[PDB]
Amino acid sequence: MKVINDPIHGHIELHPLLVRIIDTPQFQRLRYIKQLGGGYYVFPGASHNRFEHSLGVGYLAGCLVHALGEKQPELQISERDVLCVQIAGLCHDLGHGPFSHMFDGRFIPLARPEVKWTHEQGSVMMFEHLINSNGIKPVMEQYGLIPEEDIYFIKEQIVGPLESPDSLWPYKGRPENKSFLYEIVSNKRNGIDVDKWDYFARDCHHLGIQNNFDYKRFIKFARVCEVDNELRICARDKEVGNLYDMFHTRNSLHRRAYQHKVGNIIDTMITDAFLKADDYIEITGAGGKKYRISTAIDDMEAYTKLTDNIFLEILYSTDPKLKDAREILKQIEYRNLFKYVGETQPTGQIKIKREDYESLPKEVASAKPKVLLDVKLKAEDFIVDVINMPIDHVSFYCKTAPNRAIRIKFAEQLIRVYCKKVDRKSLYAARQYFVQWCADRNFTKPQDG
Amino acid sequence: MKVINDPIHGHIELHPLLVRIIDTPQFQRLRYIKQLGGGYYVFPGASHNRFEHSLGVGYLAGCLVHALGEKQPELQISERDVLCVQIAGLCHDLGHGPFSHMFDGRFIPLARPEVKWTHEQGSVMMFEHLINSNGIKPVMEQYGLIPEEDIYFIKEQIVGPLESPDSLWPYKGRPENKSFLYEIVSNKRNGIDVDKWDYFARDCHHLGIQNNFDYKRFIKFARVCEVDNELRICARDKEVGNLYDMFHTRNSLHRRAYQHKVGNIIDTMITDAFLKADDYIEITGAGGKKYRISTAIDDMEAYTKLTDNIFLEILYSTDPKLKDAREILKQIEYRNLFKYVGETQPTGQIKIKREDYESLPKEVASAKPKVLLDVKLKAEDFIVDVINMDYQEKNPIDHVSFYCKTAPNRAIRITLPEKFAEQLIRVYCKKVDRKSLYAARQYFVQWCADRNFTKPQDG
Numbered sequence: 001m002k003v004i005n006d007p008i009h010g011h012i013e014l015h016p017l018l019v020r021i022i023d024t025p026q027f028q029r030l031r032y033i034k035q036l037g038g039g040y041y042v043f044p045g046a047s048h049n050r051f052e053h054s055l056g057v058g059y060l061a062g063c064l065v066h067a068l069g070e071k072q073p074e075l076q077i078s079e080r081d082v083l084c085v086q087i088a089g090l091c092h093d094l095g096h097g098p099f100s101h102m103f104d105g106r107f108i109p110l111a112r113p114e115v116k117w118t119h120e121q122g123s124v125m126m127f128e129h130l131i132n133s134n135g136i137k138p139v140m141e142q143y144g145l146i147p148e149e150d151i152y153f154i155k156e157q158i159v160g161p162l163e164s165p166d167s168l169w170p171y172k173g174r175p176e177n178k179s180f181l182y183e184i185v186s187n188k189r190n191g192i193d194v195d196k197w198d199y200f201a202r203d204c205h206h207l208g209i210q211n212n213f214d215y216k217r218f219i220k221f222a223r224v225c226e227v228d229n230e231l232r233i234c235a236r237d238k239e240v241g242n243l244y245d246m247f248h249t250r251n252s253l254h255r256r257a258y259q260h261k262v263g264n265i266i267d268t269m270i271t272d273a274f275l276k277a278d279d280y281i282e283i284t285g286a287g288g289k290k291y292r293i294s295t296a297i298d299d300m301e302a303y304t305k306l307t308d309n310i311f312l313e314i315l316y317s318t319d320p321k322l323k324d325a326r327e328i329l330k331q332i333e334y335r336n337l338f339k340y341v342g343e344t345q346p347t348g349q350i351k352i353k354r355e356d357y358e359s360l361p362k363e364v365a366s367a368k369p370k371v372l373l374d375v376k377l378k379a380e381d382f383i384v385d386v387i388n389m390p391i392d393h394v395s396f397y398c399k400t401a402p403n404r405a406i407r408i409k410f411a412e413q414l415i416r417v418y419c420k421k422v423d424r425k426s427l428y429a430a431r432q433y434f435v436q437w438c439a440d441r442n443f444t445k446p447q448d449g
Numbered sequence: 450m451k452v453i454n455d456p457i458h459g460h461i462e463l464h465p466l467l468v469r470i471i472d473t474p475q476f477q478r479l480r481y482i483k484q485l486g487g488g489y490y491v492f493p494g495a496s497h498n499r500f501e502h503s504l505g506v507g508y509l510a511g512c513l514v515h516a517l518g519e520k521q522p523e524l525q526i527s528e529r530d531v532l533c534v535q536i537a538g539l540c541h542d543l544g545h546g547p548f549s550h551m552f553d554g555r556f557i558p559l560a561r562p563e564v565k566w567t568h569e570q571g572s573v574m575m576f577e578h579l580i581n582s583n584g585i586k587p588v589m590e591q592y593g594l595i596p597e598e599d600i601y602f603i604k605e606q607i608v609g610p611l612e613s614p615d616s617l618w619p620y621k622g623r624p625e626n627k628s629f630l631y632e633i634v635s636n637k638r639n640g641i642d643v644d645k646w647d648y649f650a651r652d653c654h655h656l657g658i659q660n661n662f663d664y665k666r667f668i669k670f671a672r673v674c675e676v677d678n679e680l681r682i683c684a685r686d687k688e689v690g691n692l693y694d695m696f697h698t699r700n701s702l703h704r705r706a707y708q709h710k711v712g713n714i715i716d717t718m719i720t721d722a723f724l725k726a727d728d729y730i731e732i733t734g735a736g737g738k739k740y741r742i743s744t745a746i747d748d749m750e751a752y753t754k755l756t757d758n759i760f761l762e763i764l765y766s767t768d769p770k771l772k773d774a775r776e777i778l779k780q781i782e783y784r785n786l787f788k789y790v791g792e793t794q795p796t797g798q799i800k801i802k803r804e805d806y807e808s809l810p811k812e813v814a815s816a817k818p819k820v821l822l823d824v825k826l827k828a829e830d831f832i833v834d835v836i837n838m839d840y841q842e843k844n845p846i847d848h849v850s851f852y853c854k855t856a857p858n859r860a861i862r863i864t865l866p867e868k869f870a871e872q873l874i875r876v877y878c879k880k881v882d883r884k885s886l887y888a889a890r891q892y893f894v895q896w897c898a899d900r901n902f903t904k905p906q907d908g
């Protein structure tokens with residue numbers, strides 16, 4: 001069977017079934033989508049793509065379930081469960097669009113404020129398209145899987161409950177005596193899953209940021225116990241130090257990289273260029289029908305051909321219709337970027353919703369600063385991007401008596417404003433607008449400097 | 450003074466002049482060319498591009514020249530010198546095309562067997578285009594540089610002696626009393642330059658290969674000293690183990706990555722697709738004039754727009770006349786690859802030249818086997834690539850000058866990996882059925898036989 005050499009995980013080997021699923025247009029697509037979006041334009045080492053990250057998650061997810069398999073035969077973990085948990089880890093990110101979180105996190109909301117679209121939903125849709133276009137279902141059977149049950153199981157591990165929306169068991173892929181398997185790839189009960197392990201390590205490796213955490217140690221000690229009358233994955237608390245190091249790494253990646261000031265301004269410049277190209281860029285989908293960037297999400301055949309390449313198709317275009325789009329991308333290249341105006345956050349735990357994003361620049365230009373001013377700005381002059389986001393929420397067990405649980409800065413939304421007008425006159429105006437806007441919505445007063 | 454955080458070199462300080470050269474569509478271009486070409490399709494970590502590597506090289510150049518000057522001020526290395534060496538470090542890979550070494554190493558020779566192309570030549574042409582397109586010359590004067598001379602010096606460091614020659618000091622950009630500045634960015638004489646330091650480290654990082662060479666130790670202890678009344682960069686005797694480790698690193702990278710079996714087959718597959726796309730892809734150059742992939746090198750404005758993107762343009766294309774090209778890239782994705790047939794070497798024989806690459810599949814198909822088979826094979830069925838290391842076969846360790854801490858001005862007179870410039874020759878077959886492959890091998894063995902290449906070694 002096939003072996004890959006990975007800079008994070010060393011020699012990792014892939015079941016033939018996994019290799020079939022990988023060697024496919026729908027999967028290979030992920031080589032053309034930057035893991036960190038415009039982060040590459042700030043971090044020269046962050047060139048990595050959703051593809052290698054996804055091999056990694058498929059591997060770790062395999063390591064975890066198999067570890068629990070050898071260490072606790074009573075759980076009844078089959079080879080069939082390992083494959084399914086591997087496929088889920090392998091495919092969890094198929095849904096990601098051009099520049100990852102930029103796409104479903106900002107661009108689709110600005111382009112079509114009325115559609116409810118997430119990269120996870122897209123993962124399930126893109127996975128359905130993958131198996132249907134490449135005849136995977138008989139190959140699954142050939143290797144022991146039961147498609148009319150396991151495909152649910154794989155989709156569920158990726159998007160959460162399918163028949164959702166109480167206390168009952170929502171899942172159809174596996175029964176509640178195997179509830180813990182749903183915690184491997186994506187898990188909201190913790191900030192702990194094999195996805196995070198991979199991209200924490202991987203992003204650290206490519207960013208040049210210290211990684212404190214050792215997943216390999218956690219898999220050897222982890223095991224399943226009973227907690228509040230269910231099955232959960234538990235840690236030996238001689239590893240609480242390891243857990244703290246993980247969260248410290250998570251906080252560093254967020255402060256230094258994900259919430260980086262220039263990296264995020266560039267993400268909004270790329271979106272701006274995409275918005276101004278949306279009418280003109282063509283992506284051929286199913287049947288020969290042509291789509292737009294903002295609409296390609298409704299056809300998996302077209303979405304398959306929708307990647308970071310759209311950046312260069314715009315950069316390199318000659319069509320006078322795409323000149324505006326072209327121009328913004330060029331300003332990125334000369335590094336004449338949008339200028340930073342300021343930051344604020346809602347008080348308190350009211351989160352601005354994706355469907356309202358587009359209305360925010362209008363709101364900001366509509367503010368009336370106390371002192372009337374020199375320059376007037378318009379809605380278009382402003383960018384508003386919304387940036388989103390203890391160890392006692394973890395279950396622990398004891399080495400001697402290895403049985404059941406032995407359990408006895410912020411915030412959730414940054415709002416930043418940039419101005420496209422660059423002179424000191426207009427930039428002074430913008431800040432005045434912004435400060436008022438923050439009052440008019442009772443957000444925290446911006447801090448100067 | 451911008452600071453860039455790099456995963457190999459940590460904080461990298463960039464002088465305003467370097468930043469101006471970087472924020473350029475000519476330089477930014479290098480973000481869209483993978484360092485290892487099709488290596489990425491075999492090594493999932495090998496996503497890195499020519500851009501960040503080039504930042505690494507400019508930085509290393511700056512470190513070495515600065516350290517030489519601060520330790521020996523009698524060399525009169527000015528800050529003007531350092532910037533020039535940095536810029537050379539920075540722009541040395543500007544001329545690379547799609548998928549790096551695949552472009553000038555195979556595609557251009559296959560598409561236009563008669564042209565003499567080289568990414569080094571490319572870099573010099575792209576450097577000029579970058580300067581003139583971006584008003585760089587005044588910005589150079591702003592910081593003490595002399596554009597006429599210093600642009601000439603930067604080009605010499607990239608491509609070598611520009612107007613030569615049959616025995617006189619061949620450069621024009623700096624006089625011989627600063628000869629040691631030309632051994633920084635590229636040194637063919639002893640295989641030690643800062644370009645290699647960066648991609649040794651960077652490729653190991655991305656491939657998951659251990660790099661046992663510490664470039665930091667080497668800079669700490671490097672000195673200019675006199676060798677045959679010409680001033681050279683010298684290592685300390687005590688450092689010799691680090692140097693061995695640098696040549697072992699180099700060797701592992703070639704054996705494990707650059708000469709990877711499957712990674713090179715995919716290279717010839719991408720090249721095949723370009724060849725079949727070449728009549729149909731258009732790239733707008735200077736004056737709205739249009740170029741092919743194979744002629745974009747003749748116009749730097751069009752070349753600027755020629756990157757790995759061309760892979761995706763072919764892949765996503767709907768034009769009926771790109772169907773064949775599409776097909777080959779689709780087979781890469783499905784991983785139905787050209788099948789491997791065998792390897793040989795021209796040991797003792799004249800080496801294969803790029804001008805003759807195109808004629809080789811016809812030679813292989815014309816090398817009728819002695820036992821007869823029911824399967825006949827044509828030229829179109831064969832791929833043959835010629836893989837070169839190739840620094841041209843010498844021993845570069847025998848050209849390292851050492852010095853002792855007791856007599857730091859005199860170079861010590863002094864009398865480990867195996868090959869440094871071997872030409873490998875591999876054939877693949879486009880048909881995959883087991884009888885066609887049995888045939889392809891028979892043609893291959895015959896070809897080697899009468900070409901007097903080494904006999905292939907039992908599957």
Ligand SMILES: Nc1nc2c(ncn2[C@@H]2O[C@H](COP(=O)(O)OP(=O)(O)OP(=O)(O)O)[C@@H](O)[C@H]2O)c(=O)[nH]1
Pocket residue numbers: 040041042043044261262265335339340451452453454468471472
């Ligand atoms: N000029 C340049 N900087 C890069 C590049 N790639 C990464 N960087 C990094 O990203 C930063 C670019 O933004 P800055 O100019 O430093 O930020 P600033 O203009 O001072 O501040 P703000 O207006 O608040 O955003 C640099 O500090 C570098 O560390 C590049 O290609 N060109």
Ligand SMILES: Nc1nc2c(ncn2[C@@H]2O[C@H](COP(=O)(O)OP(=O)(O)OP(=O)(O)O)[C@@H](O)[C@H]2O)c(=O)[nH]1
Pocket residue numbers: 002003004005019022023489490491492493711714784785786787788789
């Ligand atoms: N199947 C597959 N292997 C990959 C991939 N990416 C990297 N690899 C690695 O690259 C190496 C090359 O393997 P393959 O591409 O499958 O080569 P092959 O099976 O000999 O193909 P043929 O020449 O057609 O017989 C492998 O040893 C893997 O470690 C991928 O996307 N798919």
Ligand SMILES: [Zn+2]
Pocket residue numbers: 053057092093195199
């Ligand atoms: Zn993920």
Ligand SMILES: [Zn+2]
Pocket residue numbers: 502506541542644648
């Ligand atoms: Zn280089």
